[PDB]
Design a protein around this ligand. Structure first.
Ligand SMILES: Nc1ncnc2c1ncn2[C@@H]1O[C@H](COP(=O)(O)O)[C@@H](O)[C@H]1O
Length: 495
């Protein structure tokens, strides 16, 4: 299938969830520090909240915000939003209010469901306390929709300087989570829920469990590290997890035994480090490790590869082949399909994972999502900007990008755009943005030339936390051979 590529070949999230809740009413849907919530309780709570949402927004298709740390409440919000025909958006209320207001305008986010326990100012944004909502009439009938309905929006900073809203579909989610061989190693499907909702890794962590009758094991313990992971596996029974590459590498460096008890571990988001994958698999030979690759426009994963014994001898771990519901081609400079190994091209994705588009940029949607030949037929397709090559087994081997896009703590970032943006502060002549790694975290560093009193504080105040350089340093001149090593080193220099 060959028609798994069709969005309508996939069920809505709410139909599949309903199937699971009917089949397994008393299985554990959510495990948190307070206890468990089962499928029936989850469905009842979400139906009630949906009654409220529908009372405010009776016609399907509105964007609704969710704020808070992972809790049974936030999970319930996501389901109630989907049940209502609406789509969810993560809003971090600890970001600058002006920034959030503009995100909300971009996607017409009507209301934000505040799940925090402790009061956090809303600063005029349309927030309601989720524990404090008023009763609503039980919905006579919930809206009807197909799998092409928008499930959620994720904002991407990966291109230019304006955040682009990616609208992902019910089908993208159900195609991601159902019938996949790379998810087949943990009958109980107890997923660590760790990745915040601003990342589509969350889509896998949450819906991979709930659409399979599994359990969302929420990390309400603290920042994920070896101890917290060990607790979440040992005390709560998590058997399945996503860990982004740099987090994987750190956990493996520090305490590779902290993975013990995981049945399936998926990692990715950056080029995997073969030495760390080697260390992990040599310690846990029965562990099923998956390299997942894909952009957000294709809903979480595009290709996955189950890591083998032989793979540990290569310079890179394959990113493998198309997940079910997806197809890929590799295209040359001339826009022609590359049918042979060891010839580099651009990855192009087709199928049921394709986002509806950039909710807030029509021109960019028209430019990024285009019809291209697949087999015999013109199909909608997303050009990823990722370069790869096939190996002798017809597996994809990730090469890199030709643009300036980097991955910073889970986010794509157009680095040269942000850099150019620093240049435009008055009194600054030139500026260079660098990246380094401390512990498991990439830090942005900003070097600049210009007047002594010219520090770009007013810009930092306007940026989201995750884009603010860890250090802004004025230098006398920038080293040329630009020199990344010289610059980095000259940054301490007394620091
Ligand atoms: N397994 C992987 N190996 C190498 N690069 C990856 C992998 N997964 C994701 N990426 C990169 O991250 C981009 C998608 O980022 P995101 O949209 O935030 O999920 C891709 O287009 C790649 O550039």
């Amino acid at each position: 299938q060959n028609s798994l590529l069709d969005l309508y070949a996939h069920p809505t999230v709410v139909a599949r969830f309903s199937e699971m809740a009917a089949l397994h009413p008393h299985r554990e849907a959510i495990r948190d520090r307070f206890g468990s919530v089962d499928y029936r309780q989850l469905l009842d709570s979400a139906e009630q909240l949906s009654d409220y949402l529908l009372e405010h927004y009776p016609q399907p298709g509105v964007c609704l915000g969710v704020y808070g740390e992972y809790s049974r409440e936030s999970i319930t919000c996501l389901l109630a939003i989907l049940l209502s025909g609406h789509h969810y958006l993560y809003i971090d209320l600890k970001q600058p209010a002006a920034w959030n207001a503009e995100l909300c305008r971009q996607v017409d986010c009507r209301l934000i469901l505040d799940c925090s326990t402790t009061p956090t100012p809303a600063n005029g944004l349309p927030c309601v306390p989720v524990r404090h909502l008023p009763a609503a009439p039980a919905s006579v009938a919930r809206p009807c929709f197909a799998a092409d309905q928008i499930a959620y929006i994720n904002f991407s900073s990966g291109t230019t300087g304006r955040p682009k809203a990616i609208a992902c579909t019910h089908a993208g989610i159900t195609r991601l989570c159902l019938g996949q061989s790379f998810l087949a190693f943990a009958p109980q499907m107890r997923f660590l829920v760790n990745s915040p909702l601003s990342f589509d890794a969350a889509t896998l962590e949450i819906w991979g469990a709930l659409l399979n009758g599994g359990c969302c094991v929420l990390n309400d313990l603290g920042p994920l590290d070896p101890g917290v992971l060990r607790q979440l596996i040992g005390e709560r029974g998590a058997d399945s997890a996503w860990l982004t590459a740099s987090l994987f590498n750190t956990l493996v460096d520090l305490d590779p035994d902290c993975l013990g008890g995981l049945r399936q571990l998926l990692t990715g988001g950056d080029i995997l480090s073969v030495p760390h994958v080697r260390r992990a698999l040599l310690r846990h030979p029965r562990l099923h490790l998956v390299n997942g690759y894909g952009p957000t426009e294709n809903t979480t994963f595009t290709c996955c590869h189950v890591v083998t014994d032989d793979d540990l001898e290569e310079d890179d771990i394959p990113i493998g082949k198309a997940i079910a519901g997806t197809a890929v081609l590799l295209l040359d400079e001339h826009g022609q399909e590359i049918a042979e190994p060891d010839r580099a091209g651009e990855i192009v994705a087709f199928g049921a994972g394709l986002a509806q588009g950039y909710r807030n940029d029509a021109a960019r949607t028209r430019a990024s999502f285009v019809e291209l030949p697949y087999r015999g037929r013109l199909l909608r397709a997303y050009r990823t900007g990722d370069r790869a090559r096939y190996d002798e087994q017809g597996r994809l081997r990730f090469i890199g990008r030709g643009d300036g896009q980097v991955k910073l703590n889970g986010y794509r970032l157009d680095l040269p755009a942000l850099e150019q943006r620093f240049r435009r502060q008055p009194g600054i002549l030139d500026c260079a943005l660098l990246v380094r790694e401390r512990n498991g975290v990439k830090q942005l560093l900003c070097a600049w030339t210009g007047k002594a009193d010219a520090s770009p504080q007013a810009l930092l105040r306007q940026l989201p936390t995750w884009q603010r350089p860890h250090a802004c340093v004025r230098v006398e001149a920038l080293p040329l051979t630009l020199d990344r090593a010289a610059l980095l080193r000259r940054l301490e220099e007394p620091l």
